[PDB]
Amino acid sequence: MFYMEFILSLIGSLLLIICVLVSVAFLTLLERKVLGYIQIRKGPNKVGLMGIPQPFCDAIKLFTKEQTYPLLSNYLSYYISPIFSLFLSLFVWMCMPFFVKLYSFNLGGLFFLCCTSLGVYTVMVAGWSSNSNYALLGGLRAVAQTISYEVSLALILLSFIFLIGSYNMIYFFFYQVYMWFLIILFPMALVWVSISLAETNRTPFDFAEGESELVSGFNVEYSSGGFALIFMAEYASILFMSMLFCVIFLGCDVFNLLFYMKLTFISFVFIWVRGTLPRFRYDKLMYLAWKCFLSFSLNYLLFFIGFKILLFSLL
Amino acid sequence: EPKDIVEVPKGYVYVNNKELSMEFADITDRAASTMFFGELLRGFAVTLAHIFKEPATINYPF
Amino acid sequence: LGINRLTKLFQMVREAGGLKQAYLKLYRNDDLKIGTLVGIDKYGNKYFENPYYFYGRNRWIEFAPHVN
Amino acid sequence: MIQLMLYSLIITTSIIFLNMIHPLALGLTLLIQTIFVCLLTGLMTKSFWYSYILFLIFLGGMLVLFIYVTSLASNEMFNLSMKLTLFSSLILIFMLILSFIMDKTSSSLFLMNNDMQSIINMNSYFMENSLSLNKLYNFPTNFITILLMNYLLITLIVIVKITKLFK
Amino acid sequence: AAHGVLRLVLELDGETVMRADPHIGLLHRGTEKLIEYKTYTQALPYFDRLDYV
Amino acid sequence: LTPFFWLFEEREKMMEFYERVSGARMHAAYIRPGGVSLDMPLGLMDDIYEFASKFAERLDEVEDVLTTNRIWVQRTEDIGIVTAEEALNYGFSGVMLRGSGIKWDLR
Amino acid sequence: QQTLPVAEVAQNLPKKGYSPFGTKQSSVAEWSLARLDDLLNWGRKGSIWPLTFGLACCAVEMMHIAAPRYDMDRYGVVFRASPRQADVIIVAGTLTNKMAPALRKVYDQMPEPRWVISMGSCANGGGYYHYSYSVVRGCDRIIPVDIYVPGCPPTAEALMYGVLQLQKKVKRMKTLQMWYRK
Amino acid sequence: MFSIIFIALLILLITTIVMFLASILSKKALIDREKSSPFECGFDPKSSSRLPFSLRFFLITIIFLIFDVEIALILPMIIIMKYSNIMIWTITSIIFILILLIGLYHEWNQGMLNWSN
Amino acid sequence: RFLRYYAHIWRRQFRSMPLWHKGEKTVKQPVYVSDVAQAIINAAKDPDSAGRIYQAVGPKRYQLSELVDWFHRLMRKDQKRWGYMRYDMRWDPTFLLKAKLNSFICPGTPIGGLHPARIEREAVTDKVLTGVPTLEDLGVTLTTMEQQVPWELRPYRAALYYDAELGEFETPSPPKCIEARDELRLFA
Amino acid sequence: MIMILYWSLPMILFILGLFCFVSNRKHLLSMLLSLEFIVLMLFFMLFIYLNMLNYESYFSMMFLTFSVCEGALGLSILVSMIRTHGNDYFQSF
Ligand code: SF4
């Protein structure tokens, strides 16, 4: 009955939270192994049996490591941002689609836009709390990157949204029931990888945390426990985008293991980029954001709007 | 091959004298490369391949 | 799939002494390979060489068991 | 209950807003206010469509300017006062217990959410935003949208005219 | 990317670098004087240390 | 990262060669005023041959990966133009000078 | 000086245990605190993050260790650039007077438990530049060194052997077990 | 919704509890004058270090807002397309995007991102 | 123990340091640590100091109210808003519970050294005696608080509000010693 | 009373916003932020009315599009003003 409904809804949310957290913490190893073999390294195979408990080992180190809090009175404000970031990276999951009702969450695309937007405030205030020009430059560069890409991200969404005829994500499954949707929108997939990669701040768009240009960007002044939360937040983010890529382009077959095979392959693909590409410049990226992607997205918008008008004409 | 841009004597090799053609097949090639990232695809497949080479790590201290 | 590779696994795993005697070896050395007893050390160590691998892997050592 | 608790949280944050003077502390205060107001309007609406909208425009993009230019930082970080927090907690709680006391219904709005419409209403069985946003595009009330977009175009012509004072 | 040694004192506006003062000398190991005190054969490794790549 | 690691694999082979002749990974003392300090061990010639044999493959792998890549090209190209006259009067040399256009070289 | 036992002596002896403390604990509190120390040391031992200071000549070996021949992340070691996130500092190369305050500052900005490896002779005792007007004779005079890796430079094997020795030191550290006595 | 609200509150509470817990699990150390300085690669931080606010980043974010609002205008096209009159929905939407392109291409010839500084 | 105690948060109430008798019936004469150490070595090198007590005290006695006010001036704790007040520890019965609980809970050293024994210490006055030798007998110059403490507490300076003015606030005007007759007035 | 139970909360917040708009602040940023809070309240009054109305609801965008433009203009003149004088501080006024 009714309270059966609510109890399960909370169990599912809680159950998903532990899984996504343990997955991303455990996924970190797969980055370290996989990148280890892109390079001709062997990757972690030392601790436990073949480095399986490597990420648990990492967490124990961090939580034991003290919290080298910055200048005297910043305690809270420096302690806020990691919470307010890991929260977004997790809670963004709850809109993800199921056939087995977790929610009746409509406007899921809008909610995606919103959560992906809120990352700016976390990084920016984090740098501001740190109060170190290195951290501050990182935040500004991080802010500019995310804010710029959201513009293209929105219009890109709309192409799919029109092609499915609603904002409810679930209809991606019904429209993909015959033939996958990548093979229709191939260029969008490459662009969407880049947009997703920009959001999660991975390379080639690695300006926010980065290395060798800023020490760690905003992350530079973060002690252990805060750092662990930021680091987990980023990987919860990289997984979610991998899921969103899977549900849009590659079948949305939530009740089929092949969907989870596809999750791993896409998250692998993110790493596959990590070990291959070099980094962009500031300005060249902004050209790529406004002068290249926005034009691209508008054309497809004007292309598919006509197509659906023609489609509506036919039926 | 496209012609050079500076005539070279021996004992040297200019590494940029090659001209960027304006022939239509040549521009469309480059355009298609940018529109579908062929060069990235070449590099992408390289690293996939090079997973399949056995790592050269010595299992120290054994 | 298993092109005469699972066979090789069977050789090393079984003649190790079973599940326990394959896992403890793996658990300790972080790898399990096949060679020949080049010579037994004076101090319990055992040396193994196999030209099948390359120079990094050519020769290796199983330290004395009492060193846990 | 959620509705009047949400009044209470907005009241408390409003008292926070009028006290705080550090620009980040104020800008932080706006951020919370926006979530609360989005929640509240959503409850009394037919759906949360407009709530998601103004969230991503007002908060998501436009408060970025305010925080960013108010990154003046005062040159120093907050001296947080656990006292206004405790008063904030204190004022919240007995407002919250009063919320538990107050009349369940009469203390609620009267607006008609999609659920609080009658069953017979044949119109209500459409997509929740279809019939609401219809005449934003259908004539003869759609040209005003054209005025909006050109207004925004002109807004950019203005910004580059003000933000381009010799540098 | 700073070789571990180099220390650039940079003055930036926006993000561009206007004045870039490099402070070479964070490594200087008085090797000219030492080379003087030792013998030619002894002095030889000094040069291999220099430009160690 | 990938270029650096792939090449630093091959850097190990070359250092081993220094180790074979001189006895030190780096920082040999092998060149001395009267010629090299010491003769070479037999077979080092051949090992050099195979190493040179494979180096074309290794260098080309990274070369094809990275020379053409757009990010790298735009990331480096047209950075810090060094005109010929400005190069000389500042006392340049090496591939910097040789890159700017000057046909000079000490060899 | 001692020497390894001989074949038959090894035969008599049992397994050397895993936790270096042993398993002779008397009471529940002792036995429990022994395990928690073991877990802590296991965490701090398995994952260790150098800072990559690497001033000079020695640094090249500090890179070859990262290279794929004697892989170091294999052991759970990663080069975090930011000292706030780095757990260990491999001071390598010479410490000139201009650098001395910098090294000090970097060291104590790093949070503890912090261990320093003094790689190379230049850091160990000033190395080959010991009688120089500009060099800190050793790095013991600026920071507390934990492990010394002799060499000029140390061969990469030597360096990561020392890393393992640091892991052993990280393994046997007694913090909870002996707080109980404190 | 409030099902969503409660779940977020629960997560946030669990999140802060975890970080609260780590704050006690991590050993303390006696504070140090220098351990709490801004990180400037190991050389003393300069004066206040508060960056100049004479820059363009607000200008880019203002372009964001214009396009961010314009995005808002075009969001509902998905649903109304089944209901609205087709001429008006067709032309009205088309001129939106067309004006955007022309604004963009006109603005490339302006080239405003290639500032002199 | 001394300055960290008077600086740490738990020692403070909301913004109201509680002091025994408002900290206005206490005489303290702290000394700087290095000058104590330098005394130790100098008396270790000399064996003729053997078998001699030494009252180690600073140059100028002080009143705890003078110190804490000066401390808060140094820390910029008194400009407009941070709002320092001094209670009577006897009036408020909450400070003791903080000490008792803080002791009972912390396994290691209690947070900020809040254990009651520290509280009794601040209450106790500093009774020197003549004849008992001193640092001057040990040939040790004594850096005063006026030279040492400002830099000492510089890390804990804070409260640079956006609402108010900073920087131009004068250097913290030093405290004022307590003389023998003035002490006899204090104790009446 | 209808307004006292329904339109009261919007009033109390709106008046508090204005008073903060006419208070004392080191620069004008607190003012702009003050009127910004007022806009959110302005939206609040506007929406509860547009909710009285079956489909007139959509007018939110019109108000929102206009309101953000005021804020942008607000930040525009301020930021140009720092750049002019090297500061936009109320002491300059
Ligand atoms: S110790 Fe040797 S290898 Fe290290 S920096 Fe000095 S000379 Fe170079």
Numbering used by the authors:
A (entry chain H): 1 to 315
B (entry chain I): 32 to 93
C (entry chain q): 5 to 72
D (entry chain J): 1 to 167
E (entry chain D): 95 to 147
F (entry chain D): 202 to 308
G (entry chain B): 40 to 221
H (entry chain A): 1 to 117
Q: Would you copy out the relevant sentences from the publication that reported this structure?
A:
Respiratory complex I powers ATP synthesis by oxidative phosphorylation, exploiting the energy from NADH oxidation by ubiquinone to drive protons across an energy-transducing membrane. Here, we isolate complex I from Drosophila and determine its structure, revealing a 43-subunit assembly with high structural homology to its 45-subunit mammalian counterpart, including a hitherto unknown homologue to subunit NDUFA3. Cryo-EM particle classification identified three distinct states in our preparation of Drosophila complex I, which we refer to as Dm1, Dm2, and Dm3.
On a global scale, the Dm2 state is ‘twisted’ relative to the Dm1 state: with the two models aligned on subunit ND1 in the ‘heel’ of the complex, the hydrophilic and membrane domains twist in opposite directions (there is no apparent opening or closing motion between the domains). Inspection of the set of local features in the core subunits that differentiate the mammalian active and deactive states in the two minor states revealed that both the Dm2 and Dm3 states also most closely correspond to the mammalian active state. Figure 6a shows that, in the Dm2 state, two features of the mammalian deactive state are present: a π-bulge has formed in ND6-TMH3 and ND1-TMH4-Tyr149 has ‘flipped’ its conformation. However, all the other key elements remain in their active states, including ND1-TMH4, which remains in its bent conformation, and as a result the ubiquinone-binding site remains enclosed and sealed from the matrix. Notably, the trigonal junction between ND3-Cys41, NDUFS2-His93, and ND1-Tyr134 is preserved in all three states, occluding the Cys from the matrix and explaining why a mammalian-type deactive state of Drosophila complex I could not be trapped in biochemical assays. The twisting motion displaces the N-terminus of subunit NDUFS2 (adjacent to ND6-TMH5) and changes the NDUFA5/NDUFA10 interface, displacing and disordering the N-terminus of subunit NDUFS4 and causing a small decrease in the interface area. In the Dm1 state, the phosphatidylcholine headgroup stabilises the ND6-TMH3–4 loop at the top of ND6-TMH4, whereas its absence in Dm2 allows the TMH3–4 loop and TMH4 to move, along with a further adjustment to the adjacent C-terminal loop of NDUFA9 and displacement of ND3-TMH2–3. Comparison of the Dm1 (active) and Dm2 (twisted) structures of Drosophila complex I determined here suggests that the Dm2 state is a relaxed state, which may be considered a structurally curtailed form of the full mammalian-type deactive transition.
